[PDB]
Amino acid sequence: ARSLSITTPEEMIEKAKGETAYLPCKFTLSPEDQGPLDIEWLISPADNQKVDQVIILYSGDKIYDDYYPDLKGRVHFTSNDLKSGDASINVTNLQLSDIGTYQCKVKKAPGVANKKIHLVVLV
Amino acid sequence: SLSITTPEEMIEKAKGETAYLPCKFTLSPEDQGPLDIEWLISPADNQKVDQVIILYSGDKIYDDYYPDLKGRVHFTSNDLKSGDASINVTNLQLSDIGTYQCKVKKAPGVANKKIHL
Amino acid sequence: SLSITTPEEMIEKAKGETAYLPCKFTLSPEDQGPLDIEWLISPADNQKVDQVIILYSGDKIYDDYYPDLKGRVHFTSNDLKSGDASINVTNLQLSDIGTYQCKVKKAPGVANKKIHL
Amino acid sequence: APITLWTGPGPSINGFINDTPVIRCFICLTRDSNLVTVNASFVGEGGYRIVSPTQSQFSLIMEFDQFGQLMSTGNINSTTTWGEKPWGNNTVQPRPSHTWKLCMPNREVYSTPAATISRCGLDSIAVDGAPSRSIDCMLIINKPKGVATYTLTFRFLNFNRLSGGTLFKTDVLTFTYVGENQ
Amino acid sequence: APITLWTGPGPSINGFINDTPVIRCFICLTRDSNLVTVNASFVGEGGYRIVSPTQSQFSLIMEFDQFGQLMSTGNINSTTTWGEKPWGNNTVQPRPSHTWKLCMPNREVYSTPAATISRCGLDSIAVDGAPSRSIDCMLIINKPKGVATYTLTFRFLNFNRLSGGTLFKTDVLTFTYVGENQ
Amino acid sequence: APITLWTGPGPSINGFINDTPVIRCFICLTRDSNLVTVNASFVGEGGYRIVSPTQSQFSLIMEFDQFGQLMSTGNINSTTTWGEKPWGNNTVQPRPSHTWKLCMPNREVYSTPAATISRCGLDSIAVDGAPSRSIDCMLIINKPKGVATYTLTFRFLNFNRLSGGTLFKTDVLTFTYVGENQ
Ligand SMILES: CC(=O)N[C@H]1[C@H]([C@H](O)[C@H](O)CO)O[C@@](OC2[C@@H](O)[C@H](O)O[C@H](CO)[C@@H]2O)(C(=O)O)C[C@@H]1O
Ligand SMILES: CC(=O)N[C@H]1[C@H]([C@H](O)[C@H](O)CO)O[C@@](OC2[C@@H](O)[C@H](O)O[C@H](CO)[C@@H]2O)(C(=O)O)C[C@@H]1O
Ligand SMILES: CC(=O)N[C@H]1[C@H]([C@H](O)[C@H](O)CO)O[C@@](OC2[C@@H](O)[C@H](O)O[C@H](CO)[C@@H]2O)(C(=O)O)C[C@@H]1O
């Protein structure tokens, strides 16, 4: 449509411990969004003070996924057609300490959009 | 604009007397900032030039600033925002010999008067 | 605009001679700034490059900048202002081998010339 | 278009520390195409004319509303001479304009507080720039305070660098930040 | 006419060290009549979130072509969001213009590299500007690199000044250089 | 309108210490809406090519008349290339204009001298910003000198900070002051 945007930009998600959480981040570009595609996911965990820690990055056609120790190896982009409008991720084997607000920031200049998912984990 | 009646003067007084130092001023309608007066002193006593002695801002008098003149300097007018920022300095003594200056701001208005005692 | 005739040339000379390095220039009426001349040397001998040896500034010569050339650099024309910044380098040694640059400014004009010796 | 807010030349004692004007602050906020340049200098008066190495640190906070108008509540505030400098003269124009917002720190860029800690020489000419006659002054951009939308804080620190009592006559300080959009 | 190139607000992890994006660089190059003001700040991420005194120094080089377009080869490069800031909003416009050259360092003035080494406070608000919590940041103008025509290098130095582990959250830094002619 | 006065690129040896040109001063005074930015750098020559820790301090004074024209009497003076930089090229235009006054320090703001003492790195790229390779440079605005109306003084201080002999090749320095009104 007319500019860069995400579908359903706010959302809760409840899963039980051990299940995986599918965090959707689907977005549309406009012709004028001629910049480099520049995705990142961030986490504000509830458990501790810190806010907006990086978990995963897509930049220059490569995925950097090392950043948040606790989530090591459990976060993955879900769509191998990422450049067409799908920043969705999976968090597998949910922990109790995964409770927090997960944020998806998508940039392709002059476009910017973001979406937050408050994720909760039960027993 | 903002200006003061007789911007330069000299005043002769003997020890002990109190000295009246006029600073009557006119405002203009343009002058919509806050009223902002200070008196300073250039004593012939020291090299020191332009030390604050008494202040007026936020409709409030601050006076404690110059050691030698503590408790002996005060504003004469009961309505200072009318245009009268005159002070008198009571119980004169020879160390008070110098050039007293009255700056009066009321944005964009600005003016000042020198008096030698 | 300010120009120097023959901006590049090779000059060859064995020991003990007196090298004449021409740097003659034409001004134009635009050029209203002070005449500001510099000669530099980029020696083949060592590391460093672009080293001041002599200058003309505010109608006065300053000549002792390069220790190795001390005393053996002089301006030739006793009328530089007219357009002759040429210099002499007397009693040549083999250590003098290199590129001699001539920068002439007269705001807004600027021009330079190189000479391989 | 550019715009400058300032105290004017020969500033009044406009810097309060515990309800007493004690610092004479010259402050100039000049907005050009995109950045705002803070050009400021300070002179202590009364008990703050001379500061010693045991002087405790302090903040002089300017609080601005959402339209770039200086509020009454900060250490430096609307009760003293403050306003726009017209190009061409040294007057202080108090009548607010919508352009005043352009001098404020861009609230999206500075959505969390930013800081610059610079050296701040004291009585530098007189003491001939002696190394142990410098303190530090830190600008804090948009630290929240009360109901202010924008804030600028001059925070004076590390007086214990001083070798002894020093006339509190600061250098001209310069900072820079991204200005707010109209 | 003036012109600003920048990363935009809330910048991505756009700064690469040893092939991994680790520094979050806010960089703003504003050209007014003649000079370019570099206004920049940095936040470390991952292994670079906290730096210790034994941290080894490093350079973040921006490489630009002869028309002022950021190249893909530097530590900060065209693979991340970078472009023009329109007066009036905080967008980043990637479509290049001939005016972009005006933000480059004048190649005749800086025909050999120039440098400015500034103090660079880390986590300054939180540590209250403690003196041993500053490192140094040196801007290098036009040091040759690869086939770039213009370069800007932020080189972070002297981490051994730090009294201990410090959050790598830099102050706002400001530098200045003469801009290139159209 | 804005205006820049400068020495041009590749400056001549234009700085006098003791009746002899020894410092190569690049100086650029850019006036935008309200402030003037001083952007300057210095390179020593002859006996001043290398300076040692025992080097005694010195001032390079620029003296200007009431119309912003550089006078012949300062350490940096009208006998060397100095003038206006046109937007669009690197020439130096010597023909004076009434606009030149706009580069001068506002004589009401600076009715008594003001100063900024900044760190000044020497040979910073080569020595990799080693801490003990910085001296200080202090700008003094409007210190009276002879019959000059405006003065700018670059005063180089505290050479005893140097760990040893250092190439006198300064960083790019940046200062700021309020410009004079037309
Ligand atoms: C010299 C002095 O008074 N220093 C104290 C300082 C100043 O009073 C204010 O900064 C003036 O603006 O206040 C100090 O702490 C604070 C604030 O941080 C806090 O918000 O409120 C307290 C009151 O409990 C006090 O204002 C400071 O700035 O460090 C303490 C200084 O010693
Ligand atoms: C923290 C770190 O990795 N420091 C090394 C540093 C960085 O990797 C780069 O600055 C990355 O931008 O590189 C250091 O030196 C260099 C280059 O200057 C040189 O051209 O080549 C060498 C290898 O031969 C290396 O890349 C540096 O800049 O200091 C070494 C740091 O330890
Ligand atoms: C390297 C050197 O010669 N330093 C001396 C310095 C310089 O010559 C000047 O600064 C050059 O402009 O002069 C010093 O003192 C001064 C002046 O400051 C003073 O006004 O007049 C005296 C003569 O009585 C002398 O010129 C200085 O400024 O520090 C002395 C330095 O040794």
Numbering used by the authors:
A (entry chain G): 17 to 139
B (entry chain A), C (entry chain Z): 19 to 135
D (entry chain Q), E (entry chain R), F (entry chain S): 361 to 542
Authors' account:
To date, all Ads display a characteristic, icosahedral symmetry in which 240 subunits of the trimeric hexon protein form the facets and 12 copies of the penton, comprising the pentameric penton base protein and the externally projecting trimeric fiber, form the vertices. At least in vitro and for most cell types, the fiber mediates the initial attachment to primary receptors, such as the D1 domain of the coxsackievirus and adenovirus receptor (CAR), sialic acids, CD46, and others (for review see Zhang & Bergelson). Our results showing that the CAV-2 fiber head contains a sialic acid binding site creates a paradox: both HAd37 and CAV-2 fiber heads contain CAR and sialic acid binding sites - but HAd37 uses sialic acid and CD46, while CAV-2 uses CAR (CAV-2 does not use CD46 to infect cells, unpublished data) to infect cells. We show by structural analysis that the CAV-2 fiber head also contains a sialic acid binding site, but in contrast to HAd37 this site is modestly involved in hemagglutination.
To determine if sialic acid and CAR binding were mutually exclusive, we soaked CAV-2 or HAd37 fiber head crystals in complex with CAR in solutions containing sialyl-D-lactose. Our crystal structure of CAV-2 fiber head in complex with CAR and sialyl-D-lactose demonstrates that the ternary complex of the three molecules is stable. With respect to CAR affinity, the CAV-2 fiber head binds human CAR with the highest affinity of any fiber head known, which may favor its efficient hemagglutination. Unexpectedly, we found that the CAV-2 fiber head harbors a sialic acid binding site.
